[PDB]
Amino acid sequence: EVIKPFCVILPEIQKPERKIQFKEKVLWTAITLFIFLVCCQIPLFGIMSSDSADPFYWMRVILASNRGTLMELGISPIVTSGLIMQLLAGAPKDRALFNGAQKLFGMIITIGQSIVYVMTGMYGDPSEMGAGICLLITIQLFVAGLIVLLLDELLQKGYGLGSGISLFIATNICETIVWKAFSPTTVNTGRGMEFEGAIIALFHLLATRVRALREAFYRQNLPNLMNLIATIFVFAVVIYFQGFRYELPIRSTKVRGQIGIYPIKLFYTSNIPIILQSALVSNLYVISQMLSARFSGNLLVSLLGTWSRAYPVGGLCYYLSPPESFGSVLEDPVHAVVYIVFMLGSCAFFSKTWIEVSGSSPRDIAKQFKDQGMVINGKRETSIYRELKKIIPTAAAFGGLCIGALSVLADFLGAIGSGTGILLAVTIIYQYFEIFVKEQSEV
Amino acid sequence: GLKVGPVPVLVMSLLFIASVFMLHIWGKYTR
Amino acid sequence: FVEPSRQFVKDSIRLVKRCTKPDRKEFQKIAMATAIGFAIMGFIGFFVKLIHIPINNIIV
Numbered sequence: 038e039v040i041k042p043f044c045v046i047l048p049e050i051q052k053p054e055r056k057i058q059f060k061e062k063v064l065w066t067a068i069t070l071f072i073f074l075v076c077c078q079i080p081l082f083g084i085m086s087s088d089s090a091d092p093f094y095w096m097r098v099i100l101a102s103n104r105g106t107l108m109e110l111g112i113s114p115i116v117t118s119g120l121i122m123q124l125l126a127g128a129p130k131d132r133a134l135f136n137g138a139q140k141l142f143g144m145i146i147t148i149g150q151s152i153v154y155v156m157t158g159m160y161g162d163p164s165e166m167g168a169g170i171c172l173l174i175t176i177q178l179f180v181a182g183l184i185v186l187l188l189d190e191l192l193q194k195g196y197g198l199g200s201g202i203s204l205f206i207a208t209n210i211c212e213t214i215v216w217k218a219f220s221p222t223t224v225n226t227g228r229g230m231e232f233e234g235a236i237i238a239l240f241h242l243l244a245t246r247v248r249a250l251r252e253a254f255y256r257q258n259l260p261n262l263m264n265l266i267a268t269i270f271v272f273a274v275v276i277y278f279q280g281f282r283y284e285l286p287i288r289s290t291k292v293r294g295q296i297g298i299y300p301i302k303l304f305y306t307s308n309i310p311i312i313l314q315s316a317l318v319s320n321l322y323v324i325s326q327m328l329s330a331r332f333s334g335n336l337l338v339s340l341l342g343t344w345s346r347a348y349p350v351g352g353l354c355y356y357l358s359p360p361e362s363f364g365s366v367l368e369d370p371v372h373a374v375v376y377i378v379f380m381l382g383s384c385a386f387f388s389k390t391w392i393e394v395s396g397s398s399p400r401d402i403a404k405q406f407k408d409q410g411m412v413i414n415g416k417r418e419t420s421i422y423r424e425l426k427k428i429i430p431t432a433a434a435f436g437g438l439c440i441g442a443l444s445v446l447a448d449f450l451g452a453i454g455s456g457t458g459i460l461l462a463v464t465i466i467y468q469y470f471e472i473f474v475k476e477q478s479e480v
Numbered sequence: 481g482l483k484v485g486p487v488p489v490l491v492m493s494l495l496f497i498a499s500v501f502m503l504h505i506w507g508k509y510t511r
Numbered sequence: 512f513v514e515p516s517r518q519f520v521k522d523s524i525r526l527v528k529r530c531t532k533p534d535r536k537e538f539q540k541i542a543m544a545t546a547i548g549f550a551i552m553g554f555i556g557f558f559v560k561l562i563h564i565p566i567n568n569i570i571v
């Protein structure tokens with residue numbers, strides 16, 4: 038109860054009594070993502086140097102972060118606070134208190150992570166900075182996290198289509214893909230002035246100079262056109278598999294006469310297997326890198342991963358890492374097989390565990406059907422859970438397996454954005470599209 | 481609990497961005 | 512290990528057989544919506560970054 042006095046001292050977005058139509062929701066979602074994008078390009082003040090290694094390079098994709106800028110914590114405070122409060126709950130006014138505690142724990146996590154980032158050695162030496170510079174960075178990150186929570190609450194309360202977390206993750210992934218496809222940034226080595234952007238390179242190479250096509254396609258130091266082709270192909274395949282669904286014909290027994298279709302998608306858990314697997318792997322990368330930086334030489338740290346951008350060469354983090362290129366696959370086929378097996382198994386296991394946990398289990402769906410009077414069209418009321426026990430577990434496990442296979446395919450093909458990134462982007466965009474079609478069908 | 485809307489949130493975000501920029505310009509012109 | 516795997520494969524094949532594959536029209540609609548959303552997000556981010564690179568260089 039002592040949280041409640043501190044829960045009220047934080048702003049809350051005004052809940053719109055009248056529902057907003059799709060056009061204004063899309064416009065405000067665009068405004069929110071534009072604000073986030075502007076914030077993630079503005080560097081912090083007081084940063085002495087950014088020439089050091091980046092401790093959390095593996096979190097910058099799943100947490101929608103950006104090193105050295107305002108959006109450096111990204112969405113980590115929101116996810117951490119939400120998970121903490123969900124674990125506490127598992128262990129009107131009630132929802133207002135819940136949201137206030139969400140905000141309070143988000144600010145606490147933001148302060149803690151800002152202190153950790155300041156003391157971990159980046160931005161320069163914390164001791165040489167002084168109290169003023171480190172403190173100013175702390176307020177900058179605190180206000181940035183407050184703004185992220187405000188935007189997320191705006192989206193959740195209704196001025197936006199979905200949630201801040203998914204929107205920011207998808208926006209960062211899409212921005213990365215478009216930048217690697219169209220970057221005007223140029224890098225020189227001696228062959229000539231070459232654009233980093235894959236498509237920009239093609240126009241530049243042809244105008245500057247048949248070989249040009251080979252240089253633009255089979256290039257190995259900057260984004261390629263074959264990488265973009267792989268990205269487009271993975272987009273198309275993930276879209277095709279996302280469109281998969283199982284259509285149960287359900288009837289109604291309470292209101293005599295009401296017919297509908299209950300869809301059980303192939304991607305039953307959506308991108309949750311990808312989110313869980315990628316979060317686990319990235320946290321393992323960060324932990325292994327930090328342990329190998331400090332306690333280098335210990336056998337346990339060596340087994341957790343030996344690093345060489347630092348990429349693993351041996352250990353658990355190495356066997357959990359996608360092959361660097363095709364030559365990596367040929368040189369170490371055992372690593373490729375182990376990584377494929379780990380990806381598929383982890384994705385399937387996470388999918389089935391998530392349907393058991395979240396509340397989409399066949400027993401829970403049968404209970405929901407019983408609460409609403411819905412019965413399958415031909416199956417008797419007795420066979421409502423069984424016809425769900427024959428679909429939902431298999432659908433969840435196979436959706437996890439397929440989404441893991443798509444991630445492996447994207448990683449092997451060399452896709453810009455990577456398997457996780459691309460899969461997260463497609464799943465989030467499809468969530469927005471399905472919200473759109475739901476709103477249209479309601480009208 | 482101070483309740484605000486979407487436009488006030490946008491204004492607050494833009495003014496925070498402006499404040500960070502003014503801090504940066506202050507540093508640049510005092511160096 | 513063998514029988515559970517065979518059962519899982521059979522169930523997966525049965526489910527894929529009974530799923531409702533996206534038709535051309537449905538696939539075209541989903542692809543168009545995904546392309547529009549990706550274009551919006553990625554190009555807004557790209558333009559923001561492209562504007563802020565000169566601004567970042569000027570300020571710092």
Ligand SMILES: CC1(C)[C@@H](N(O)C(=O)Nc2ccc(Cl)cc2)N(c2ccc(Cl)cc2)C(=O)N1CC(=O)N/N=C/C=C/c1ccc([N+](=O)[O-])o1
Nearest residue numbers: 099113116117149150151153154200202203312316317320
């Ligand atoms: C929080 C954290 C992120 C970490 N963690 O906690 C952190 O912080 N870390 C840090 C802190 C501070 C600093 Cl300064 C730095 C770092 N972790 C962990 C784990 C395990 C262990 Cl054992 C530990 C931990 C965890 O998990 N986490 C998370 C991760 O990783 N990821 N996430 C992702 C999500 C996504 C999503 C959501 C939703 C969505 N949608 O889409 O809707 O999507």
